[PDB]
Curated annotation (Swiss-Prot):
It catalyses: Hydrolyzes the link between N-acetylmuramoyl residues and L-amino acid residues in certain cell-wall glycopeptides. One of its GO terms (cellular component) is outer membrane-bounded periplasmic space. It comes from Mycobacterium tuberculosis (strain ATCC 25618 / H37Rv). This is N-acetylmuramoyl-L-alanine amidase Rv3717. PANTHER family: N-ACETYLMURAMOYL-L-ALANINE AMIDASE (PTHR30404), N-ACETYLMURAMOYL-L-ALANINE AMIDASE AMIC (PTHR30404:SF0). It is an enzyme of class 3 (hydrolase). The active site is at E177 (proton donor/acceptor). Cell-wall hydrolase that hydrolyzes the amide bond between N-acetylmuramic acid and L-alanine in cell-wall glycopeptides. Is able to hydrolyze the cell walls of several bacterial species (i.e. Paenibacillus sp., B.avium, E.coli DH5alpha, E.aerogenes, L.acidophilus, B.thuringiensis, B.pumilus, B.subtilis and E.coli W3110), thereby showing that it is a cell-wall hydrolase with broad-spectrum activity. May have a role in peptidoglycan fragment recycling.
Length: 214
């Protein structure tokens, strides 16, 4: 899998202003907000820092495997690109795999991951390789000890039509919600360097697993 191209997207920006309410295409004919601030744990640990820090670990491990990588953003302290631009950046790289990282803000009772993929598919890639990617990633996250969400999606998977990053993708692309920041157990993982590394190692498996099918 050495030499393959992976686009990594740590969801959200390190900082925001009024410009995130700017309307950008959804990829399905409508518009949505350029960005969203994202959620956080009860103690104030932000989604945007979690995805940034976890993405860095993911990036490092893939780099060590000889995999080519690029980030949707390069910091956690300034404005980042809108959600359509992050898809366009990826498309320009014609990647073998695209992975977006997020963390949920759901009912405290719920915990665990779910993998989002574009549905119904807008192209052959979204209909095939991306679904295969989502399934492989789900199995690898599970085999690594990350529990599947029991409160959202079904069986750790979720067909979405509302995500611009997924809708606009022309290359294998999934968006992983790693867990629920509002859940005490999930947040304990997220707020820890050790937990973020576990998340990252699991992600590497899912990515490497899918890249190996190319
Ligand atoms: Zn913040
Ligand atoms: Zn998010």
């Amino acid at each position: 899998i050495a030499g393959m191209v992976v686009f990594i997207d740590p969801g959200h920006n390190g900082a925001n202003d009024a410009s995130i309410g700017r309307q950008v295409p959804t990829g399905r004919g409508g518009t949505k907000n350029c960005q969203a601030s994202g959620t956080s744990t009860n103690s104030g640990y932000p989604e945007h820092t979690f995805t940034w820090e976890t993405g860095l670990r993911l990036r490092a491990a893939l780099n060590a495997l000889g995999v080519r990588t690029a980030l949707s953003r390069g910091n956690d302290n300034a404005l980042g690109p809108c959600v359509d631009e992050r898809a366009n950046m990826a498309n320009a790289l014609r990647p073998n795999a695209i992975v977006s990282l997020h963390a949920d803000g759901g009912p405290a009772s719920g915990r665990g991951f779910h993998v989002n993929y574009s549905a119904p598919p807008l192209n052959a890639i979204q209909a095939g390789p991306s679904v295969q990617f989502a399934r492989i990633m789900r199995d690898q996250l599970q085999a690594s000890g990350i529990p599947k969400a029991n409160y959202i999606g079904q069986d750790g998977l979720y067909g979405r039509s509302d995500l611009a990053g997924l809708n606009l993708a022309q290359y294998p692309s999934i968006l992983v919600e790693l867990g629920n920041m509002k859940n005490p157990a999930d947040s304990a993982l997220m707020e820890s360097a050790e937990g973020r590394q576990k998340y990252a190692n699991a992600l590497v498996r899912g990515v490497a697993g899918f890249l190996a099918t190319q």
